[PDB]
Amino acid sequence: MATYYYALGSQKFLLEEEPFEEVLKERRRDYGEKNKEIDFWQVIQPAFLNAPELAEAKAKAPEKNVAIVSTNKSFIVWVKLRLEYVLTGEFEAPSDAIPDPLASLD
């Protein structure tokens, strides 16, 4: 298993108001330029949220949600500072509850 860090918000906020996939795209391009393995992803309606270890987060989460996920904690620290209205946390994967850290429930 590896540890995944996440910032979770509503689709309203992260897909429409502040389409964060814009910032992710420029980060992906810069990673490419530097020959760096991409270690961050946007996941819409993430399946990880149904894991028992994340019950507290699911209990507070928007009905229609989306996560920025990374194996680099630093990045998620900055995503939280950048967006602020996001829940944050971490999980280990793959596991029984989270067989695919990047899977969507849609």
Numbering used by the authors: 1 to 106
Original paper wording:
Mg-protoporphyrin IX monomethylester cyclase (MgPME–cyclase) catalyses the formation of the isocyclic E ring by cyclising the methyl propionate side-chain at C-13 to the C-15 bridge carbon between rings C and D, generating protochlorophyllide (Pchlide). Recently, the small monomeric protein Ycf54 was identified as a second candidate component of the MgPME–cyclase. The Ycf54 protein has been identified as a component of the MgPME–cyclase complex.
A fourth Ycf54 mutant in which residue A9 was substituted with a glycine reduced Ycf54 levels by ∼75% and CycI levels by ∼50%. The FLAG-A9G construct, which like the A9G point mutation was present at lower cellular levels, pulled down CycI in quantities similar to those observed in the FLAG-Ycf54 control pulldown. Therefore, it is reasonable to conclude that although only a small amount of A9G accumulates, there is more than enough Ycf54 protein available to interact with CycI, so allowing the MgPME–cyclase to proceed unhindered. To investigate the structural basis for these effects of the A9G and R82A mutations in Synechocystis, crystal structures solved by molecular replacement against the WT Synechocystis Ycf54 were obtained for these two proteins to resolutions of 1.5 Å and 2.2 Å, respectively. Superposition of the A9G and R82A models on WT Ycf54 resulted in respective RMSDs of 0.19 Å and 0.28 Å over all Cα atoms, showing that there are no significant structural alterations between the WT and mutant structures. Thus, the phenotypes observed in A9G and R82A are not a result of the mutant proteins adopting a different conformation or failing to fold. Further analysis of the local structure around the A9G mutation shows that there are no alterations in the immediate hydrogen bonding network or surface electrostatics, indicating that the phenotypic consequences of the A9G mutation do not result from alterations in the structure. Comparison of the WT and A9G structures found no structural reason for the low levels of A9G observed in vivo. As our pulldown experiments show A9G Ycf54 interacts with CycI at levels comparable to WT Ycf54, it is unlikely that the reduced level of A9G has a structural basis. One explanation for the lower level of A9G could be that the glycine codon inserted is rare in Synechocystis, resulting in lower levels of A9G Ycf54 translation.
